[model samples]
Target chain A: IDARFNVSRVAVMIVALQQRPDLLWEGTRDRLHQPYR
Target chain B: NVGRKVTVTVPGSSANLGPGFDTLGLALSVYDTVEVEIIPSGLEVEVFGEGQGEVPLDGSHLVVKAIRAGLKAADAEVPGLRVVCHNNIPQSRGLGSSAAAAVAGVAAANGLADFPLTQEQIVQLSSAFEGHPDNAAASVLGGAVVSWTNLSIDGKSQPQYAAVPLEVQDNIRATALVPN
Candidate 1:
């Protein structure tokens, strides 16, 4: 692997998956929130 | 915080991406792990994997120095430290091994002190060691980053390094062919 998956990223996804497993079947760009300082 | 122990895992990073120069960095999959324990008395340092024989095993070590700075910042007093490093990232190969070591040390200290420092504070403290933020910030934030150096007009204040994460497109990937 070029990089190990980030722990924080995994934690976010775990909760999201639990909340809405159906979302995984249909991809959406809604989660692409812009990061700010 | 004597008898406290912390383990930190930091990713290696590549800086100066294309036209981004020192303003950009990308975190890689490779990693380094450090374990720090505050002891009652003398210093103890051990290394494994990369730079094992070459890196110092005393207070002069970069990790040790960073740990001391982190402790001082938190107002935590410890008589000595036992630090162990397991390095998978290649040293001096433009992979940000030094930055990872510094981050690991500072993070370990923060962990011992119940994490008083913010993520931004960790970035600033670790970046001061390199006089730049690219590599350090990348490891801290994890993933790609757009970073900058902030200098005061008076030129007397210590330079500040700041960064924000850049979300990578789902289809994008990175490959590096490191050479010794």
Candidate 2:
């Protein structure tokens, strides 16, 4: 999802990805990935 | 002659979800309560809870304002009204706090005036005050609604709506994840 999308859409996308493993990209293998600071 | 007492409950709403701007509004389970006791003479307004501390307690208040407007629309002489409001929704947080208050107030006045205002009239009135129909539509209809902004041949703005079904409703679950 792009930044232009509102908070609700972003939230929806995040949750959808978390619930469906098949939707995850190979580069982002893990369903939930946290970027290291 | 003595007037009657009426109670109205309006659900809180959320607006502008995704591409839907003023055209979309959702009515949540949250609510605001308004009790209007009609009397012989001007208006008396009282408020409690949530943003009530900061809300005005006079004709300048949105509730009182909406009631007066309703009375005018109903062609009834503005009588004395004792308005007690219990506010449960958050204000200015993209929530429909103001919309709830406005709807409740107008609905109360309509009931007191024998419902001279039609449902469409009430919707139009509330939409005019709130600058949109999305929040008002959801609050009045009690579900997810899709509202489209249309233009009339006379160049006026019109709104068309469709309700989201319960089967579709079941497919989505709204999870609120709060950060501590």
Candidate 3:
């Protein structure tokens, strides 16, 4: 496990997964969609 | 009347400042938006900035699912959603990836609902599903929010909330270096 995961931080971040975002993700596929479409 | 067309804008949220753990989060200026309208039937999803090719274009969509939930919560389910998700937030810890999306979906549903549920009510409904209200709270309520979950008598977590204000100096700016 990476240090950034930090147990608590990873755990905190995953609520999003467990709870779910209800939206699709394309940001990782693309870099920075800032200024937004 | 505004009819059935509305758009909802939600900010990205990230948290766990220092050793703050799960009880922390804040909304960034960055945003993702969901645009909705009253279509004839079924569900129509449109992805602009965020998920495309990777995500579905129908009810199976994560954002559209959220829109459905939000509408049902307020007894205002619509036929379809002409969603345009303009996502600018990253999926990492501090960037509030999922939190932003979830907030966008919920808020968009409410927005398209033509104002049946008020803003605070929208927050409450979304927060109820969020489990941890911090990141989602920031996306929904905006600004820096100091939040904590109420533990059940037996230790399971319950989604109860109370707000505490943080008043920093005029020139208080902070930064962090995170990982992927």
Candidate 4:
């Protein structure tokens, strides 16, 4: 969001991922939320 | 013997694959081999390597247990069967040594049975025998699998698994529960 802009970047990112699902997958992000085995 | 001898080989599995934890498993290049032949004795398990002196040579080994369990499921009786196991997978070292044996035994029995069990049935029995699905699923299915364990109300565990479809490989799920 800009100085006065109300657009939520997080929500926008979610929608972007929803459209192109492959962009959301990768080994790095998987490690972010879970412990590596 | 009216029934013929059966030999079954199942690959060992590696679980977790990072982030997937216990929920994901892949069949590795390693394997456990088994051969079964009807004999005068009711049951015998001859094990070699990895668990040569460790796993039971009698009917109490995991492979025999799996064989008998599958036969029970099929409502059949083994008058006597001789089993030889060549174990190559590392025991209790993350690689699925036990799951490989269990699947091999189940598959042998399935082959000896009049009707023969399907791969799905083999997966079900193998997963349940190990109390987890990941390694068992991949070992039985020969690929990467997303799997989990389902415990029953009566304090029993049933492992459940589903293969990732062809188009969506590796992008399935990050949080896993295997064979974990």
Candidate 5:
């Protein structure tokens, strides 16, 4: 329900899609990649 | 015209990828294909698979409503319509079945009208139904996506939804265990 979290994941996806490794790493920092551990 | 028809195929999507919540989505391989055509009079709808008996087969149907909206947006008119939907995505499974259906309907209308709407326009129109863009945008764009909704400061206007496609890693794959 939080738009902030929703948009952040999209940001990570964009970086991954754009082949921006640096940005992907930065975007995903301290973020859980999936719902489960 | 007796047989003016259009076929639209749209993929199912998964929204809220981990931390992405409502903004992140991935388009799955599962699809809902719809075929819409102009008819002489009255609306006719036929649905197969996933939502066959459970879903409605009338103007109140989500797909039908979407088709009407799409036709209106495209500024195209027809006497009536016959819509046939072949659905592979499960309903109420968080697989974006509704979004796929909406996309299929709108895409079919766009196809029938010589594709006047751009891909983004299709996404926007489809997203309006869901009030969020994640699943709709992912289904429209295919593959991974990031979507957002923008609201005007006055809050009088409708929320604006937008999304972008992402290239997934070659080694990555999506595997799902759909529960009944």
Candidate 6:
């Protein structure tokens, strides 16, 4: 699980599914945290 | 006298200013004066100025064609006409010269034949020939116009128009970008 996506242990699975690189689709870098920084 | 001859001066119009392509026209003070007198011949046309050497003087002239169309719309018989044109606008410059000529010719024919066609009828008739209502509407109504294309069906076109209010109209001034 990525630090940006894994807010909790339950969220880790959601983040891993969202960021899975083997999903037979183009992967996109997460950009939701740029505005906050 | 058979009928009194009438002379009409119609101003040259500018079309396609900004986003109003084929839907906007401005009638300048510049004019092409046309004098029509009933005669015993078929149709005699004489064109002068701005492209006098190239403009047709016979039946093939656009002015003559528009006059004939107007007469036909009025359900009147074609008569011998002596049309003397003093063209002031530049030819083929995309500045509504042909539209102006068409309007002037139709107006002259309507005046000579005493046709009961109203100004709106004249505008629609001219637009039918010119393929657009922007220049025709502006020429007939004399001012800024905004026209919207409603629908096109069966080789015919329809448009709706609204006049730009003076408050908004006066706030803007136009500058031409002429290419030499």
lDDT score of residue B13 within candidate 5: 93
Stretches of candidate 3 off by over 4 Å are: A1-37, B1-3, B17-22, B118-120, B152-158, B161-170, B174-180
Candidate 4 CAPRI-style tier: incorrect
Off by over 4 Å in 1: A1-37, B17-22, B153-157
**Per-prediction backbone clash count:** 2, 0, 5, 7, 1, 0
State the lDDT of candidate 1 residue by residue for B7-36, as single tens digits: 999999986433222366778889999999
lDDT of 6: 0.63
What's the CA error at residue B132 for candidate 1, in Å?
0.3
Question: TM-score for all predictions?
Answer: 0.78, 0.71, 0.68, 0.70, 0.83, 0.69
Best by TM-score: 5
Task: Estimate how well candidate 5 is docked, as a DockQ score.
Answer: 0.30
| Residue B134, candidate 3: C-alpha displacement in angstroms | 1.8
Residue pairs in clash, model 4: B22-B177, B22-B178, B22-B180, B23-B176, B23-B177, B23-B178, B134-B179
Deviation (Å) of B42 in candidate 1: 0.7
For each candidate in turn, the interface RMSD (Å) is: 13.4, 9.5, 13.2, 11.3, 4.6, 26.0
Best by lDDT: 5
Q: Stretches of candidate 4 above 4 Å error?
A: A1-30, A33-37, B1-3, B17-22, B149-180
| lDDT (0 to 1) per candidate | 0.78, 0.66, 0.61, 0.67, 0.81, 0.63
Candidate 1 vs candidate 5: the TM-score winner is 5
TM-score of model number 6:
0.69
Q: For candidate 6, write residues B72-148 as lDDT tens digits.
A: 87777644778888888766776677778888878877887786788777877777676666566666666544444
